[PDB]
Design a protein around this ligand. Sequence first.
Ligand SMILES: CCCCCCCCCCCCCCCCCC(=O)OC[C@H](COP(=O)([O-])OCC[N+](C)(C)C)OC(=O)CCCCCCCCCCCCCCCCC
Ligand SMILES: NC(=O)C1=CN([C@@H]2O[C@H](COP(=O)(O)OP(=O)(O)OC[C@H]3O[C@@H](n4cnc5c(N)ncnc54)[C@H](OP(=O)(O)O)[C@@H]3O)[C@@H](O)[C@H]2O)C=CC1
Ligand code: SF4
Ligand code: SF4
Ligand code: SF4
Lengths: 342, 176, 155, 49, 45, 318
Amino acid sequence: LHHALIPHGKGGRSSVSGIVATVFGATGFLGRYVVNHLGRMGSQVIVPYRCEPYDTMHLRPMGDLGQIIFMEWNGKDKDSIRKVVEHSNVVINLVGREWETKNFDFEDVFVKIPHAIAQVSKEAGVEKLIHISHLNADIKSPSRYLRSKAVGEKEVRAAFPEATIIKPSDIFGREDRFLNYFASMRWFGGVPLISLGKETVKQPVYIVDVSKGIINAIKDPDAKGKTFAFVGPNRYLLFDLVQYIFAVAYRPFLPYPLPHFAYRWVGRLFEVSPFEPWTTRDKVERVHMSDMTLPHLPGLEDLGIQATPLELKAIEVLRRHRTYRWLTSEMEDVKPAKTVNI
Amino acid sequence: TYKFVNMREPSMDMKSVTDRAAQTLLWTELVRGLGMTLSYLFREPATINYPFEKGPLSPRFRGEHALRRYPSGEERCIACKLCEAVCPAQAITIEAEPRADGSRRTTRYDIDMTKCIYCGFCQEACPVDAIVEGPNFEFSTETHEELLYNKEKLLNNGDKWEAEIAANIQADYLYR
Amino acid sequence: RGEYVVAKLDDLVNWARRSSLWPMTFGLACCAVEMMHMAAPRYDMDRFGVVFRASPRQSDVMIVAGTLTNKMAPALRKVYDQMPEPRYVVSMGSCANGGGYYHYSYSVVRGCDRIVPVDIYVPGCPPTAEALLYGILQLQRKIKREKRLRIWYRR
Amino acid sequence: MELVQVLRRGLQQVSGHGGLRGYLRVLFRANDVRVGTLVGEDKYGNKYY
Amino acid sequence: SKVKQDMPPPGGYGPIDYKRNLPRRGLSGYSMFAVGIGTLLFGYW
Amino acid sequence: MFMINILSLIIPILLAVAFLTLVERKVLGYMQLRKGPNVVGPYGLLQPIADALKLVTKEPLRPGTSSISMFIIAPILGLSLALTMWVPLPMPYPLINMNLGVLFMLAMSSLAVYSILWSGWASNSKYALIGALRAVAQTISYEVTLAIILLSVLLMNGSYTLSTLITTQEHIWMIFTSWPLAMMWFISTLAETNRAPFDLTEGESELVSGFNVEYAAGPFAMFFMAEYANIIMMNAFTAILFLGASHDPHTPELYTINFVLKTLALTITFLWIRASYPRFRYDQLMHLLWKSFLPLTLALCMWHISLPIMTASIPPQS
Ligand SMILES: CCCCCCCCCCCCCCCCCC(=O)OC[C@H](COP(=O)([O-])OCC[N+](C)(C)C)OC(=O)CCCCCCCCCCCCCCCCC
Ligand SMILES: NC(=O)C1=CN([C@@H]2O[C@H](COP(=O)(O)OP(=O)(O)OC[C@H]3O[C@@H](n4cnc5c(N)ncnc54)[C@H](OP(=O)(O)O)[C@@H]3O)[C@@H](O)[C@H]2O)C=CC1
Ligand code: SF4
Ligand code: SF4
Ligand code: SF4
């Protein structure tokens, strides 16, 4: 190790672990938790921020004095990357936009910048790189979410020989836009999902299990090159999500098997609001698509991180949606969803 | 010697009860309260127009540590470390080393602004009046790190002010 | 031009917010009294926005004045989340900044950074009453250099 | 008779502070229009009274 | 040079008032009532 | 035609309500020896704009325990009530010449207490609920004296037509005839309008904000402006009742100048009176009301009904 890069301490806030994890685009969900994990044992996590410093302000408390070094950067600027990962001994990619922007074509958010940060990092002199792919990454799938993910996944794989690519499943957490999403059809309408849910089986994974995966991948030296898939403990047919989520929130269950034809129209109308595309045409077939088993690539279970069941922690995200009359209801009052899985 | 306070006796005569009854019905002490505030409305304010107007201070003001230098140019701190021993918050961190010339010079002089208390003990410590609290208070910051001062910042603060604090200790060392 | 339009809107919103903060007092120690002199006519703050509306719900910036204790830690925190955004916290004095004179103590967390995201730090023990007025003013100029609507336009 | 005298003093404040532009500038920049004697200007352009 | 520390003048200082000197201002109790009734009678008329 | 008069009435009323925040922080300060809002805007002319803009750009919080249906009707029920209460005000020739205008003003004044009652129920918090419960009970207790004072005053005036006020009060201010009831009336205005010594809810520390305990920027604009809105008018109602001006038919300008100055001066005293007195404890409100204010008002109504009969001074209703 380098003269000062050598680790030291009991894993406290002011303990140097010697890992300099420059995370890319940490101002949302998984970025918030990984830096929380990254800053727990102490690490110079240089976070290149691009939004208003106010929205990045809440990353400060999870770092010791002189740890969360926010740095100005821009995606287009070639030198923007080279300055933020010059001294970072490890680089954790987290870039990507689940929704769409006119200036950010969906190809970019998973092909251009991920390739635009992988090659600079390898030119800088880094040791490792972790680009986050999707467990279902597949270009041939009609999902532009999947279509852009897969091509970018192999680009960083080709560009970076040691690119430890992570392919987590549909992660869930406090701001996952997956659980709080699936609670939102009650607000939006009569659950316009396709085929009443009996056409799609997914395997959600709790974010801390995911985030503990990367940091455990950091200490693991053999993780280089190997493409680990982060998978939840059990799968779940799509209908089971809808009834369970509407149960752990005490919402009026109004399911409706609206076919894919009319449900695709509401996607564009949700993008019509020129402030945030609540739901996109990509998100139309995103949930209809089911998760492939993908058994050959290693998982987090053999990496030392077990998987926490979804029904173990739902109201931790869903108590907010629980009305005043039923905000106090926990899992036990609610039946567990049918575990359609292995 | 002593004195009561609430030992006034109310007179029961026709005159005294009339004033009290008049006071209760025709609120007069309330109007007296109104007159007090109204007279103050026409009283000029004492609002110092910051930043253009600034509050008064004294040549003894304590804040914003800054190492000084001798008229020759060499810095005052000989690393006598009485300030370190005295510092009641242990905000001072000094490591000494024999400089190439031969005399001492601190290779590490960090005073943590957010551990210090500006008690003014440190100037009284070093007999070479090396460290002093300057007249600055206008060094509020937005990141916790820049508060953690070091030797370089301390010297830069000293070179920045120097002249202002040069007269301050000239008009106060008689008292000390 | 579009950038001009988003610039004028940014100035209009920024000028309103910076000039009319409604701070909520969270004084715990001697740092409270000296800020409380900013209320005294000598360094009147109500001259620019910052007023008596209080009501932590109706508050933009929170001033954490005094030492922070572990038993005070959660109750102060839950106030911060209940405080609606744009929420900024002002670190008052050596104790709230980094623990100060009680840094090596068992009943105080060193600094407010371990609890809330501190936007501005005002040194002093206690900081002079006018020095906080400067700290509020520099926070006011910090809001002036904010590009919320500009950064949205780039997106 | 003091009312016009003070009002005359108010007019002198406007005239002394750069007439129209000067008075308007200091009011919109310093929120005060008190005319005062000059001590000098060190090097920058910051005038003191 | 002799002692030059801050000293009060040889005559000390001006005698500083410290009593409670609330000036009794007002009108006679009957006078306040009489003027109140007088305005009412004028108003009624 | 008619609609252009509607905006010409309510809109200047609304813009005056926003500005009243400035003087509340300024003339108090100039009495408190402070300076008041001065830096923003020339002489603090722009602070209410800065105040109002963040309230319409800050995040509107809806607590999970709050019924959104009740959370939205109440601020509308309050602000709209204050504005429609202005329609019978006798500005030279009133916009609405309701012959029962006195009852009309009083009737929806009772409707105001539903604004606080529903908000206290909507907020649904232990401290918040009791704070509104022992706030509504204050306002209703002050309306009984409010009605009795009104009933005595217009008994000598005539009918309940608000335009008749300027006719009866031709030569002498009506206060010279009912000054024992004028202060009886004025303090009653100080209590319905929720101002010290009856600030109670909106007290910055009495009930921290009372009706605004959990109720912050956004919808809170229509719940901290309405109370100040009733302040200008209920004083103006006092201005018409006891301080009536003269109205020349060929020049209504004189009465506009006189009434506006009189009601503006009264509001100064209203802002004067917050900065000079403490806050009544809850029991003291009822003790002052039921046992001292209520009996005296009844006796004065005893006097003011017989006096026109005593001196053959009954007024013409038509
Ligand atoms: C021929 C004549 C016929 C008519 C004669 C009528 C009787 C003679 C006149 C009597 C006095 C006038 C009527 C009563 C007035 C007092 C009522 C009352 O309850 O008083 C005692 C009350 C209560 O006093 P207390 O509580 O201390 O004592 C009451 C008695 N015990 C204790 C037994 C309950 O006093 C008040 O209410 C004080 C005022 C409270 C509000 C605070 C703000 C006051 C602001 C004052 C300045 C501004 C005045 C503005 C006036 C209007 C301008 C438009
Ligand atoms: N279930 C899921 O949601 C899964 C998601 N993923 C992928 O993981 C990644 C991160 O997810 P998550 O943290 O939840 O997402 P968030 O939307 O919460 O955060 C995405 C981050 O990407 C940054 N970013 C994206 N594009 C750009 C750009 N062009 N320039 C600058 N910054 C950019 C954002 O910065 P800023 O906020 O400033 O725009 C933000 O920090 C995404 O690519 C996502 O698709 C993978 C597997 C599962
Ligand atoms: S002022 Fe006191 S606490 Fe601060 S550095 Fe000097 S001796 Fe230490
Ligand atoms: S007390 Fe003075 S001379 Fe001694 S080490 Fe400290 S600054 Fe230097
Ligand atoms: S910083 Fe100083 S004044 Fe402030 S609370 Fe701590 S010891 Fe007290």
